[PDB]
Design a protein around this ligand. Structure first.
Ligand code: SF4
Ligand SMILES: [Zn+2]
Lengths: 431, 66, 107, 143
């Protein structure tokens, strides 16, 4: 990929001065299209209630689950509404989960408890559930189909159940010369060390073209874009924040000089709290708004970068699922989120969102080629396949303040390589 | 009138068009038409032969501090 | 009687001086505007977090997640504490539209 | 020619008792970055061949590929003067070697090497792509 090509030449720099030194040029970004328009909210009227969201979620997700239960259990179909069930008869039900957990805090670290019930709910009534089903892997808000019978105590006995699955995916055109994309998250400007300072300096010095030989300068010239994904100012306590936006403005100036940059709000960043987070206001960045290479986005970000389509968050859905479930692997939680056809199924019950009423926008309408996450504690990447011809690369971006690691994504081979930065510390090997 | 005020009160409580006590009446009529559940072409034909009257173009409980 | 004939007199967010035009900042207190935007968006952020914890608690006290809430229980603190945050949010959202929009929306 | 920057470095280092990175010695003398690294290597080679016992400390940079557990990572490190060859033998592929800094009296960690670059950036803010090896085209002040 990158470090293979970075040694492909001769080395000139352990030498006395010369007449000329080589220069290069940044590769063109001749196609780009932002398609994150359902997350940019222009009107923003509150004063509705959260019942309009669940109803449109069920009404939109129902035909997918009917069409999958047909070909997953046989076209001798027995799909039936929750009220028209007769005692001890084999049928399929399509509904919404609700997990009834105590230890979840009310108004007046994991939170799973050894006893907690699942309830299948439709628009008119509910029913309890027991049998062969996982009690702690599933969360409230997933829509699914299920197979079984109504027993004598009013409960329901489950044999097997199925999720919605992956959406269709059109193929991408192949590329001629490999272009790279760099992904960073969580610089933590405001607190978090001094080795993080030299790490941030060495990272911007490599990507801008100040560091290393003609190998590194030829290979960093091919990096086409830069994406910064959330949690730019890590905060120690709210009640500091004014002096940090000055330094963030300086860093975005030093990056806006050479590359195009995309900046996203995170868990602590001066924006709203609900989930389609709106872009940062330009009045906090005097210096960096001189150039038209800096762009400010928000939370759920879609794009079409050179044919390859991207979609990502700053890691607020994945940690929310991590709170109220039993899965630990963040790459697995990201793939599970992909499997139920919903970016954030736990919303709104433990993760706040805007009260939409026309259409729920967190249902996947297509399949992305790349799908990344936000502030995960360690690097990971994987390739997964669909039932049809659908392949997806899954990346979890590490957190720069502890690991000092970023990710390079190739746009022609579609692979991801880590990059790590480490200056020497107070290290003396004679003690 | 007095027969048109029960048709709208019947459209407002049918559960197969949505859970609607936060929005207008014509917005819920167009929401169901987009998804095309089965809006009937009579709850439209009284919301056109009237102006902006608050006892036609409003949900049943548009008072009521809920 | 006279209370209805308000002229919607706007005021500077920094030093409280009534003046003609709709801009939020005063001409003497214009340099410190990034700090005055920074201040009060951490208030909108904390009102947003209080709207959502309350209006979904009624859904769990009611039983259902798919139908409307009707409970005007005068002995519940939940009622009329869920009514005032709508207006706090209504007011604090409109104070930040004094500042322009952070981008376009018709693209 | 040579005596110009040789005497400039000999008064910056040993008289004013300062810490000279390559970016400071390229913002002082108005030089390209790679030529500044070559200048520093010239000075250290001359004064280390002359005497062998100077009050001179160096710090280098080593970059290149590695495999920890299967995966190919790319490790970049700013290294002292004792531990260079072991770090060079741990790596798989080598991709960049030059010089980073010189000193008079030995430091304890990588503290002031950020203070120097930060302060010389602080006053020199309208140019950072001026001596950069990569010159993009669409980034010119417009808005
Ligand atoms: S207002 Fe209070 S009592 Fe009424 S449903 Fe809400 S939480 Fe329950
Ligand atoms: Zn003022």
């Amino acid at each position: 990929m990158f470090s293979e090509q970075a040694a492909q030449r001769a080395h000139t720099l352990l030498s006395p001065p010369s007449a000329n030194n080589a220069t290069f040029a940044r590769v063109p970004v001749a196609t780009y299209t932002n398609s994150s328009q359902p997350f940019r909210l222009g009107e923003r009227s509150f004063s509705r209630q959260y019942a309009h969201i669940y109803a449109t979620r069920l009404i939109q997700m129902r035909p997918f689950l009917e069409n999958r239960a047909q070909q997953h259990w046989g076209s001798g179909v027995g799909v039936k509404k929750l009220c028209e069930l007769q005692p001890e008869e084999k049928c399929c039900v399509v509904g919404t989960l609700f997990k009834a957990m105590p230890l979840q805090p009310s108004i007046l670290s994991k939170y799973i408890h050894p006893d907690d019930e699942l309830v299948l709910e439709d628009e008119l009534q509910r029913i309890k559930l027991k049998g062969t089903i996982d009690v702690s892997k599933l969360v409230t808000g997933t829509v699914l189909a299920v197979f079984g019978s109504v027993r004598d105590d009013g409960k329901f006995l489950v044999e097997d159940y199925c999720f919605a699955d992956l959406a269709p995916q059109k193929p991408a055109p192949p590329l001629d010369t490999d272009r790279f994309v760099l992904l960073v998250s969580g610089l933590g400007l405001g607190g978090g060390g001094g080795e993080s300072l030299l790490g941030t300096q060495l990272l911007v010095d490599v990507v801008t073209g100040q560091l290393g030989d003609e190998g590194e300068q030829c290979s960093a010239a091919h990096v086409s874009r830069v994406i910064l994904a959330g949690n730019l100012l890590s905060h120690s306590t709210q009640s500091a924040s004014v002096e940090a936006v000055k330094m963030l403005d300086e860093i975005l100036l030093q990056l806006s000089a050479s590359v195009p940059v995309d900046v996203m709000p995170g868990e602590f960043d001066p924006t709203n709290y609900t989930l389609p987070q709106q872009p940062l206001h330009p009045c906090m960045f005097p210096l960096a708004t001189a150039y038209s290479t800096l762009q400010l986005v928000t939370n759920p970000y879609q794009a079409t970068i050179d044919g390859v389509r991207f979609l990502g968050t700053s890691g607020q859905n994945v940690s929310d699922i991590f709170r109220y479930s039993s899965m630990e692997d963040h790459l697995e939680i990201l793939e599970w989120t992909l499997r139920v056809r919903h970016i954030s199924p736990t919303a709104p019950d433990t993760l706040g969102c805007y009260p939409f009423y026309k259409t729920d926008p967190f249902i996947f309408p297509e399949c992305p080629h790349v799908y990344f996450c936000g502030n995960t504690p360690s690097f990971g990447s994987k390739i997964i396949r669909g039932p049809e011809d659908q392949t997806v690369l899954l990346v979890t971006v590490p957190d720069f303040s502890a690991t000092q690691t970023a990710c390079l994504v190739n746009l022609r081979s579609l692979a991801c390589q880590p990059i790590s930065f480490s200056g020497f510390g107070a290290e003396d090997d004679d003690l | 009138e007095e027969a048109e005020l029960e048709l709208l009160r019947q459209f407002d409580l049918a559960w197969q068009y949505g859970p609607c006590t936060g929005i207008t009446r014509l917005q819920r009529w167009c929401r169901a038409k987009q998804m095309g559940l089965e809006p009937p072409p009579e709850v439209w034909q009284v919301l056109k032969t009237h102006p902006g009257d608050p006892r036609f173009q409003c949900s049943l409980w548009h008072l009521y501090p809920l | 009687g006279l209370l209805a004939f308000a002229k919607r007199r706007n005021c500077c967010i920094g030093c409280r001086t009534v003046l003609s035009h709709q801009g939020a900042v005063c001409e003497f207190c214009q340099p410190r505007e990034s700090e005055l935007y920074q201040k009060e968006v951490s208030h909108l952020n904390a009102l947003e977090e209080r709207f959502s914890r309350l209006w979904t608690q009624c859904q769990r006290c009611q039983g259902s997640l798919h139908e409307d809430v009707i409970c005007t229980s005068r002995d519940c603190p939940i009622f009329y504490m869920r009514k005032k945050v709508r207006k706090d949010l209504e007011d604090q959202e409109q104070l930040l539209r004094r500042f322009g929009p952070p981008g376009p929306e018709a693209w | 020619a040579d005596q110009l920057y040789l005497e400039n470095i000999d008064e910056f280092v040993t008289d004013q008792n300062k810490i000279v990175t390559y970016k400071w010695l390229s913002y002082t003398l108005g030089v390209h970055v790679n030529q500044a690294k070559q200048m520093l290597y010239d000075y250290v080679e001359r004064k280390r061949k002359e005497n062998s016992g100077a009050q001179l400390h160096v710090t280098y940079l080593v970059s290149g590929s590695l495999i920890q557990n299967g995966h190919s990572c790319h490790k970049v490190a700013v290294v002292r003067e004792d531990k260079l060859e072991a770090v060079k033998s741990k790596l798989a592929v080598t991709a960049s070697i030059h010089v980073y800094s010189i000193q008079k009296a030995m430091l304890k960690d990588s503290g002031p090497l950020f203070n120097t670059d930060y302060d010389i950036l602080k006053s020199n803010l309208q140019n950072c792509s001026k001596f950069s090896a990569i010159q993009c085209a669409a980034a010119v002040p417009r808005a």
